Amino acid sequence: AEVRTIKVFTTVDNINLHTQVVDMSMTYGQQFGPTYLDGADVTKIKPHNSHEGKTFYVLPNDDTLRVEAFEYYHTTDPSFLGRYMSALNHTKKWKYPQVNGLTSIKWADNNCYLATALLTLQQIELKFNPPALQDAYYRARAGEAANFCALILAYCNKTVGELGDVRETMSYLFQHANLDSCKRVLNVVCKTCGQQQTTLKGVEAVMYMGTLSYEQFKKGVTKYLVQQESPFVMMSAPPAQYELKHGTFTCASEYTGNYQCGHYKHITSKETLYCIDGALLTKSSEYKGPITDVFYKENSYTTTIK
Numbered sequence: 001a002e003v004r005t006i007k008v009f010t011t012v013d014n015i016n017l018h019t020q021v022v023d024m025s026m027t028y029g030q031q032f033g034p035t036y037l038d039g040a041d042v043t044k045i046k047p048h049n050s051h052e053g054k055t056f057y058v059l060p061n062d063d064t065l066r067v068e069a070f071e072y073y074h075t076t077d078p079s080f081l082g083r084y085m086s087a088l089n090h091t092k093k094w095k096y097p098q099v100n101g102l103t104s105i106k107w108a109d110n111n112c113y114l115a116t117a118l119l120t121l122q123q124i125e126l127k128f129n130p131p132a133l134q135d136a137y138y139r140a141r142a143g144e145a146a147n148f149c150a151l152i153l154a155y156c157n158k159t160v161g162e163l164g165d166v167r168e169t170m171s172y173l174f175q176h177a178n179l180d181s182c183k184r185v186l187n188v189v190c191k192t193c194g195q196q197q198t199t200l201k202g203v204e205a206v207m208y209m210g211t212l213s214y215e216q217f218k219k220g221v222t223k224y225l226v227q228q229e230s231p232f233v234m235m236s237a238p239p240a241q242y243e244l245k246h247g248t249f250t251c252a253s254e255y256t257g258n259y260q261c262g263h264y265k266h267i268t269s270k271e272t273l274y275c276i277d278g279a280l281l282t283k284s285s286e287y288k289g290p291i292t293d294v295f296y297k298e299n300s301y302t303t304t305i306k
């Protein structure tokens with residue numbers, strides 16, 4: 001049989017391309033292990049004349065790719081690239097409309113939690129350690145968030161169509177952001193026992209579960225905030241009917257519904273109050289509803305309590 005070939009580029013990061021020659025009589029799986037073309041799995045398919053020149057992903061089956069891959073994703077999960085492509089295969093069909101000055105995601109495949117989280121990240125100062133996330137966040141800020149959402153699914157071990165928790169997701173991303181300058185000192189007091197002062201750093205320093213109001217946390221829940229050093233704070237608690245006031249907060253997640261089967265919305269404080277429901281938009285001067293996460297910006301705070 002006539003043995004024909006084409007040339008292609010393989011990569012793990014789409015930053016280093018490595019020219020390959022493929023036998024057209026064999027599937028890519030017989031030459032590259034698993035193989036993808038914008039996420040679509042091409043392991044079981046044989047080369048086409050049109051694939052010549054095009055860039056193909058591969059699993060890091062050789063030391064170069066392993067290095068390239070860790071340097072780019074900051075992970076060694078042997079399944080990461082696969083889960084990123086499969087997700088990407090899906091998130092590329094999503095629409096990412098600009099809603100109220102920000103990138104959003106039209107509802108599809110239970111992505112309400114990804115949308116609310118993508119709106120939140122555009123609004124708080126976050127610097128990602130993995131290049132993959134740095135690169136995809138920057139393209140994402142410009143309405144091309146298909147890769148950003150697909151990497152989030154793969155970093156948070158979720159599959160398209162499953163519902164996630166906003167707070168759990170953001171927690172994952174925080175583990176990949178550079179939040180080392182972040183500190184938190186708490187003081188707790190009893191009139192009989194004593195007082196316990198905790199100090200927290202990093203991810204734990206910007207996240208709290210039990211209250212939605214920063215102001216309450218500075219007065220007392222007796223636990224009170226003594227010092228906080230962070231670009232922002234995330235205040236979280238199980239959904240409770242709550243009232244947000246223009247100007248007192250940056251953003252917030254509304255979780256309507258039941259445990260692991262509800263709907264998420266994002267409220268943002270700009271010149272007025274806006275509800276960003278995926279690709280839908282309402283404005284209002286006040287807002288009340290089932291709120292679970294409030295986000296407040298910050299630089300430095302020190303208490304006056306003694």
Ligand SMILES: Cc1ccc(N)cc1C(=O)N[C@H](C)c1cccc2ccccc12
Pocket residue numbers: 163164165166237238239255257258259260261262292
């Ligand atoms: C969407 C989702 C996916 C995975 C997991 N593990 C949880 C959730 C989820 O529903 N979280 C909301 C905010 C929630 C959190 C905490 C307590 C809650 C009690 C009652 C209702 C909602 C509650």
Ligand SMILES: [Zn+2]
Pocket residue numbers: 190191192193194
């Ligand atoms: Zn006591």
Ligand SMILES: [Zn+2]
Pocket residue numbers: 221222223
């Ligand atoms: Zn208490």
